[PDB]
Scaffold this motif. Structure first.
Motif, mmCIF file in Angstrom:
data_model
loop_
_atom_site.group_PDB
_atom_site.id
_atom_site.type_symbol
_atom_site.label_atom_id
_atom_site.label_comp_id
_atom_site.label_asym_id
_atom_site.label_seq_id
_atom_site.Cartn_x
_atom_site.Cartn_y
_atom_site.Cartn_z
ATOM 1 N N UNK C 36 5.053 12.054 92.252
ATOM 2 C CA UNK C 36 5.190 11.316 91.005
ATOM 3 C C UNK C 36 5.614 12.287 89.923
ATOM 4 N N UNK C 37 6.715 11.940 89.265
ATOM 5 C CA UNK C 37 7.382 12.704 88.218
ATOM 6 C C UNK C 37 7.557 11.774 87.020
ATOM 7 N N UNK C 38 7.284 12.284 85.819
ATOM 8 C CA UNK C 38 7.448 11.518 84.594
ATOM 9 C C UNK C 38 8.403 12.205 83.626
ATOM 10 N N UNK C 39 8.990 11.432 82.713
ATOM 11 C CA UNK C 39 9.919 11.935 81.718
ATOM 12 C C UNK C 39 9.770 11.128 80.452
ATOM 13 N N UNK C 40 9.228 11.749 79.384
ATOM 14 C CA UNK C 40 9.096 11.075 78.086
ATOM 15 C C UNK C 40 10.517 10.922 77.503
ATOM 16 N N UNK C 44 11.926 16.562 79.079
ATOM 17 C CA UNK C 44 12.138 17.043 80.438
ATOM 18 C C UNK C 44 11.268 16.389 81.491
ATOM 19 N N UNK C 45 11.568 16.689 82.757
ATOM 20 C CA UNK C 45 10.815 16.177 83.897
ATOM 21 C C UNK C 45 9.482 16.902 83.981
ATOM 22 N N UNK C 46 8.429 16.185 84.360
ATOM 23 C CA UNK C 46 7.071 16.719 84.490
ATOM 24 C C UNK C 46 6.479 16.237 85.789
ATOM 25 N N UNK C 47 5.933 17.151 86.595
ATOM 26 C CA UNK C 47 5.284 16.759 87.838
ATOM 27 C C UNK C 47 3.873 16.266 87.513
ATOM 28 N N UNK C 86 -0.819 7.458 73.839
ATOM 29 C CA UNK C 86 0.560 7.449 73.340
ATOM 30 C C UNK C 86 1.397 8.575 73.996
ATOM 31 N N UNK C 87 0.733 9.698 74.360
ATOM 32 C CA UNK C 87 1.347 10.860 75.014
ATOM 33 C C UNK C 87 1.832 10.558 76.441
ATOM 34 N N UNK C 88 1.402 9.408 77.019
ATOM 35 C CA UNK C 88 1.765 8.989 78.373
ATOM 36 C C UNK C 88 3.013 8.108 78.418
ATOM 37 N N UNK C 89 3.678 7.901 77.256
ATOM 38 C CA UNK C 89 4.919 7.120 77.184
ATOM 39 C C UNK C 89 6.024 7.861 77.936
ATOM 40 N N UNK C 90 6.467 7.286 79.057
ATOM 41 C CA UNK C 90 7.472 7.919 79.898
ATOM 42 C C UNK C 90 8.051 6.957 80.902
ATOM 43 N N UNK C 91 9.148 7.377 81.550
ATOM 44 C CA UNK C 91 9.718 6.721 82.714
ATOM 45 C C UNK C 91 9.001 7.453 83.863
ATOM 46 N N UNK C 92 8.425 6.714 84.813
ATOM 47 C CA UNK C 92 7.757 7.327 85.954
ATOM 48 C C UNK C 92 8.606 7.119 87.204
ATOM 49 N N UNK C 93 8.963 8.222 87.863
ATOM 50 C CA UNK C 93 9.742 8.208 89.094
ATOM 51 C C UNK C 93 8.869 8.645 90.259
ATOM 52 N N UNK C 94 9.151 8.103 91.460
ATOM 53 C CA UNK C 94 8.549 8.596 92.686
ATOM 54 C C UNK C 94 9.660 9.316 93.445
ATOM 55 N N UNK C 110 13.164 4.705 88.706
ATOM 56 C CA UNK C 110 12.199 4.852 87.623
ATOM 57 C C UNK C 110 11.664 3.534 87.108
ATOM 58 N N UNK C 111 10.500 3.600 86.458
ATOM 59 C CA UNK C 111 9.804 2.482 85.828
ATOM 60 C C UNK C 111 9.307 2.972 84.472
ATOM 61 N N UNK C 112 9.625 2.240 83.392
ATOM 62 C CA UNK C 112 9.240 2.681 82.056
ATOM 63 C C UNK C 112 7.885 2.181 81.625
ATOM 64 N N UNK C 113 7.038 3.120 81.164
ATOM 65 C CA UNK C 113 5.720 2.839 80.602
ATOM 66 C C UNK C 113 5.747 3.192 79.111
ATOM 67 N N UNK C 114 5.366 2.232 78.255
ATOM 68 C CA UNK C 114 5.283 2.427 76.812
ATOM 69 C C UNK C 114 3.820 2.293 76.410
ATOM 70 N N UNK C 115 3.277 3.300 75.714
ATOM 71 C CA UNK C 115 1.888 3.249 75.265
ATOM 72 C C UNK C 115 1.828 3.278 73.732
#
Lengths: 110, 61, 117
Positions: C36-40, C44-47, C86-94, C110-115
């Motif tokens: 699981x990788x996220x991108x606000x 940048x990409x974050x593991x 709010x810091x978890x707002x990102x597109x989440x990729x597997x 990807x799937x977008x999460x908005x907090x």
């Protein structure tokens, strides 16, 4: 624990020029390093694996190398389609230091 | 101490599971397939070994 | 052949537990790392973490531990955001590692999460 320091943050290069992107590992990772290309609205694409191997379907202009803690992504003959953002991925999920991405490099083509 | 001790236990349990996912082939009769199967088995064992050796080194300093 | 599809991306108020799912299809392999990788947005990409599919072996980034739970299913891998901010707002990729060598060969769109509060 593992931190991948990626430099530079942004690069502007004309067509046919050479692009050098560096990643410094905060811990010894050996061949546990890969390079990715990401264009807006798309997921990343694998370029280099095991630090220096060219991934299938990737142009020959993409080169990966590593010595100890320092890793380099070289794009020899930059094309207009190479305008993207680049990332390194170091380590391993089960390693003590985990796995981590570099801060990325935004490449613009003149 | 405890975080790293747990991780190391989690890492070894994973390494054991990887070895258990590569069982030796059972025919023992050649058949060019049994020869191809053993070459395939050996490659995978060498790979699990290097991964294990590398994972473990991260916990040894 | 090999395909990854992420779903569950919604707009959530901070603290609302949310589960994202990675539909795993066409993999010949039994066991492999599903990451699981996220991108606000504009970042940048974050593991986040990974699970080794055959087992129950979960691995999390130092910042992700306690806030994220990766769960393995027969045909899926889920990522639960226990209490998002709010810091978890990102597109989440597997992303799947098809060799066990650490690198990601297959990605989901990807799937977008908005907090937001």
């Amino acid at each position: 624990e593992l931190v991948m320091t990626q430099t530079p943050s942004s690069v502007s290069e004309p067509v046919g020029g050479t692009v050098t992107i560096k990643c410094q590992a905060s811990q010894s990772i050996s061949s546990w390093l890969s390079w990715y290309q990401q264009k807006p609205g798309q997921p990343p694409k694998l370029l280099i694996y095991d630090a220096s191997n060219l991934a299938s379907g990737v142009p020959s202009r993409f080169m990966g190398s590593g010595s100890g803690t320092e890793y380099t992504l070289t794009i020899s003959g930059v094309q207009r389609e190479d305008a993207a953002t680049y990332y390194c991925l170091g380590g391993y999920p089960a390693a003590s230091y985990r796995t981590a991405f570099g801060g990325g490099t935004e490449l613009e083509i003149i | 101490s405890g975080d790293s001790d747990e991780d190391l236990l989690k890492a070894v349990r994973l390494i054991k599971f990887l070895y258990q996912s590569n069982p030796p082939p059972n025919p023992e009769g050649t058949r060019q397939a049994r020869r191809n199967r053993r070459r395939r088995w050996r490659e995978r064992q060498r790979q699990i070994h290097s991964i294990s050796e590398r994972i473990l080194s991260t916990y040894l300093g | 052949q090999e395909q990854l599809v992420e779903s569950g991306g919604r707009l959530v108020t901070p603290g609302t537990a949310l589960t994202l799912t990675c539909k795993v299809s066409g993999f010949s392999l039994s066991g492999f790392w599903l990451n699981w990788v996220r991108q606000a947005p504009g970042k940048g990409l974050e593991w986040v973490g990974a699970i080794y599919r055959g087992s129950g072996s979960e691995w999390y980034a130092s910042w992700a531990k306690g806030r994220f739970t990766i769960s393995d299913t027969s045909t899926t891998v889920t990522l639960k955001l226990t209490s998002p901010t709010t810091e978890d707002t990102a597109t989440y990729f597997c992303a799947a590692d098809t060799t066990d060598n650490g690198y990601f060969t297959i990605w989901g769109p990807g799937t977008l999460v908005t907090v937001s509060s």
